[PDB]
Design a protein around this ligand. Structure first.
Ligand SMILES: Cc1cc2nc3c(=O)[nH]c(=O)nc-3n(C[C@H](O)[C@H](O)[C@H](O)COP(=O)(O)OP(=O)(O)OC[C@H]3O[C@@H](n4cnc5c(N)ncnc54)[C@H](O)[C@@H]3O)c2cc1C
Ligand SMILES: Cc1cc2nc3c(=O)[nH]c(=O)nc-3n(C[C@H](O)[C@H](O)[C@H](O)COP(=O)(O)OP(=O)(O)OC[C@H]3O[C@@H](n4cnc5c(N)ncnc54)[C@H](O)[C@@H]3O)c2cc1C
Ligand SMILES: Cc1cc2nc3c(=O)[nH]c(=O)nc-3n(C[C@H](O)[C@H](O)[C@H](O)COP(=O)(O)OP(=O)(O)OC[C@H]3O[C@@H](n4cnc5c(N)ncnc54)[C@H](O)[C@@H]3O)c2cc1C
Ligand SMILES: Cc1cc2nc3c(=O)[nH]c(=O)nc-3n(C[C@H](O)[C@H](O)[C@H](O)COP(=O)(O)OP(=O)(O)OC[C@H]3O[C@@H](n4cnc5c(N)ncnc54)[C@H](O)[C@@H]3O)c2cc1C
Lengths: 265, 261, 276, 276
């Protein structure tokens, strides 16, 4: 069967707060294996923790908060970890965060606290600060060996980048699943900003496909949905049985994509 | 590089009237090779002129052989030709004379640009696939510029037909008629009348979306965009869109084909 | 691997044009001697329609037959001659040993189409005949089916082979070859290969013939206007890749648009296993 | 498509050798000016071990720094010098602005292995260091694991990058790159590319370095001993294909064994999107 998960971010306005819960209600009927909530230091753990508790309380779904260790002391982290665990949060997305402690150190500290289910980040197009592609792979390996359950990739628009990366992970002896993070695109300007700051390559055919649509939201949605549906179709054919969606707190595109994958209520 | 045409139908309500004209405005900016208006086998003629005088686009009215005598047809044919209307979609008509007779008649009145219908999946009345094909050839041999197919969802069937056609000596392009589906129930119905097949994968694709208009449109746009993409790679450079008076889906599909303002 | 094993099973033909200067004349004969060592099935010499320089074409042909003993085929157009002239010209060729003709209509400056020329020629004698094909549709055709149907009409009049217009998108050719079968055309569809060293010139030919130039190719030649060497290396790479792919798809015949130059075509043939 | 979009994300480096004649000297500086316009991350100059011509190497280096302002890396071998000489030579480089060194052992005419040189150099200063790698195993290695383990030892001493021996079988490289990860080697494995125009010479280098030459390649150059032009076109095609494939597999860095010639490397870079 096909497994799916949805990623959300803490809303900063009443309007976005409403949008978020509407999307959670909608997407939850698809019985995702789990949902996660991002962390933004300048946009705090309490906002993240709050949403996580809300999801669990109203939907009963497994909710994984994203926890970063940059700027947090090991002692604080242990306290944080113990509190989430004692309150039913058994899945955590262990991250370093943007610059003392790397994600691998967080994974170790978390496993010392409890048998958490753990998800970590992987980069098909290499982390921007990595010493090299080879190093980035060895580091994911070390991170995995610390005790993780799965790796979720940064978004990508070149499906081949993902496939070659998966083969390299397998050759590297990394046994856990390399779940592709899918970014359905409706706002191309925003996606370009994301890709630029993450070293993700936006192929020419794609940039051309969105050319001239700056003020046409409806066409962007249709074009973006088509691109996303095609990508997951190719991934499925290539054996991918798990997908993680970067919903940006919006449900329509992801819901529709899951539908074409057979993931339905 | 790709030529596109948009088909509309006479609005039956005030709401649909507004919708049509807005779509006409929207779609016109794509400079289609021509637009056409269906004729229920009265208001068709007015819309054509309305379109012509409003956008300057070549508007081709549809004309049938239902409830019309050769004398009346020639009359209409003449009335149209003298009105700057030199392109006509010749059809027998939804139930005497066949479409082939209409074209010979029309050509007899003047050098008319003519579009006729083709049926990749065999016209319902036809005895056999071969008989219907031979019939198309005869209709074309009568003086047609291009054939426009009934909508379809199995690209394979369309392609084999296109192959059979040239093999049968038909010297015109078999332009695929594209039906962007946002309402599956309605399309399911259309297919029942037109004898068009709804592949299993398509039925499974829309299953459970009866009350999800939003997801239906995305799924539909995806199916149609994928279709024209496969078609374009097969050499097809002409598309006729059954817009049902709506602009957004066709507009978006055209965009992916490179047809933009 | 495949291109290596295919060595020895490929036929080739080279196309030349009547030189207009002493410089080009010397270049042409040098290319002829060099390419002759490859033992092409035949070579052909163009004739510009509406040029009135038909004397130059027949001249080069005789010269090639004299100097190399290879079968030389002149390109004959009909848009600029009458059926009687044509028959007269046809008779003269036959009696002089020129038994293979590339029957063409020629660009409009009509009364005759290539198919008429094919019929006319067959009435005169049992010529070996080659005709033009357009994977991307002849620019004047009303439709792709019409153009394709025209090719069948032409072939039915007595044609031994079709030689396509040059193309840069290999799929366009492969699809056309398949559509030719669907149309009942029974002759081999020989791809015409245009090795590119001068992109500006190829670009003009392309836009003049309705031939598409993919973006990746235009990208490859970008910034090379004043770099002839890099152009030749880039072009040879593109040409060699195209024939390798076509060869793997079954093509066993290639017609080269040499533009009177030998090096590029010579090297491409080499990679195809066509050597002295 | 892919090779087209990758344009602008590829780093390149060029390797030269001290000219032995006035002719080669002029050729070298011409190639340097031409290749300099491509803005390579760095260029390097070899030094024949046991040659005693180290003066020529440092000379060319200074000349390149003076004339182009590009980072120039000398190749330093240890099999023919003592630790003191080496440190002395190392100090002189550092004080003259030569902060990048290709640390090599050199062929046996021992007391030192490349890893010792890497340690020695790091004690003198914080040099940027490149070392040799062998996708097809160094000829003296007892086993592939030993050789691979040696590379790790070398890398652990303070290396910024590894540059492989040239190869013609792309899979050999891709597999090696993967085995390097399995061995815990954390530096990028930059493929060294040897464009071939002179096959007889490449053949000698190959058999001299344990590098394999596939049959299809040997087939491609068969019969071209006295045809330099076809050789260059055939070789450019092979080189361009190899980098296209490597580029699609993630390689973003290439080191070219130019043999002091610029045209082939220049054109290959062009197809990689590396332009002036
Ligand atoms: C699915 C996903 C979700 C994310 N969610 C968030 C979020 O909610 N909030 C947020 O702030 N950021 C988030 N990020 C972004 C992430 O925090 C940045 O990419 C960050 O720079 C690195 O985090 P990491 O967990 O990958 O760190 P690491 O795995 O530690 O990697 C970072 C770098 O250090 C190197 N490295 C790793 N381990 C070692 C080691 N032991 N020794 C030396 N070098 C090492 C790596 O090769 C790499 O270049 C997410 C990324 C993904 C792909
Ligand atoms: C692009 C397009 C637009 C259309 N627009 C309209 C519209 O505006 N209004 C409307 O009423 N309908 C419209 N139709 C539908 C059409 O009118 C019906 O399908 C109708 O059944 C008549 O078909 P026809 O025009 O194909 O005529 P024909 O080609 O005359 O008829 C088809 C049937 O008759 C048989 N046949 C044809 N010629 C002969 C012959 N000489 N002898 C014996 N058998 C023969 C064929 O095999 C076939 O079964 C359209 C169809 C298409 C594809
Ligand atoms: C291998 C090759 C070699 C060539 N060599 C030369 C040369 O030496 N000299 C020169 O001047 N040109 C040459 N040409 C170019 C060529 O002459 C032009 O492309 C010309 O415009 C058409 O020539 P054709 O022989 O294809 O004629 P046809 O096959 O007669 O012409 C094709 C055009 O007329 C249409 N057509 C055919 N029959 C009919 C009909 N009965 N009614 C209406 N339309 C019809 C076709 O579909 C098409 O658009 C060559 C082309 C090729 C591919
Ligand atoms: C990019 C590149 C540039 C080059 N430039 C030059 C140049 O300018 N001048 C020149 O003379 N040569 C040059 N060479 C050739 C090179 O010097 C030879 O291949 C040499 O024989 C080994 O050098 P190395 O630096 O790999 O040494 P190492 O890595 O020390 O040597 C490799 C050999 O010794 C074995 N070995 C290593 N450590 C031990 C140990 N402790 N005990 C036993 N065996 C061990 C290895 O497995 C292997 O067989 C170059 C090679 C490359 C790939």
């Amino acid at each position: 069967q096909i497994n799916v998960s949805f990623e959300f971010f803490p809303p900063r306005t009443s309007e976005m707060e409403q949008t978020l819960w509407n999307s959670i209600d909608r997407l939850s009927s698809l019985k995702p294996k789990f949902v996660s909530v991002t962390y933004g230091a300048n946009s705090e753990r309490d906002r993240t923790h709050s949403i996580i508790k809300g999801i669990k309380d109203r939907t009963g779904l497994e909710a994984a908060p994203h926890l970063t260790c940059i700027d947090a002391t090991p002692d604080e982290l242990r306290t944080i970890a113990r509190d989430y665990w004692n309150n039913g949060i058994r899945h955590i997305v262990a991250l370093r965060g943007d610059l003392e402690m790397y994600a691998s150190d967080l994974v170790t500290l978390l496993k010392e606290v409890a048998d958490f289910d753990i998800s970590v980040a992987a980069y098909p197009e290499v982390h921007p600060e990595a010493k090299s592609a080879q190093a980035d792979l060895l580091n994911l390996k070390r991170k995995v060996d610390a005790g993780v359950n799965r790796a979720i990739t940064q978004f990508f628009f070149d499906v081949e980048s993902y496939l070659r990366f998966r083969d390299r992970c397998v050759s590297a002896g990394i046994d856990v699943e390399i779940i592709p993070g899918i970014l359905p695109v409706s706002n191309f300007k925003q996606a370009k900003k994301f890709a630029d700051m993450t070293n993700v390559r936006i192929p020419a055919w794609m940039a051309q496909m969105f050319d001239g649509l700056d003020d046409d939201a409806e066409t962007r949605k249709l074009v973006g949905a088509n691109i996303a549906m095609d990508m997951v179709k190719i991934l499925s054919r290539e054996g991918v049985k798990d997908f993680h969606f970067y919903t940006l707190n919006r449900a329509e595109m992801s819901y529709a994509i899951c539908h074409t994958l057979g993931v339905r209520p």
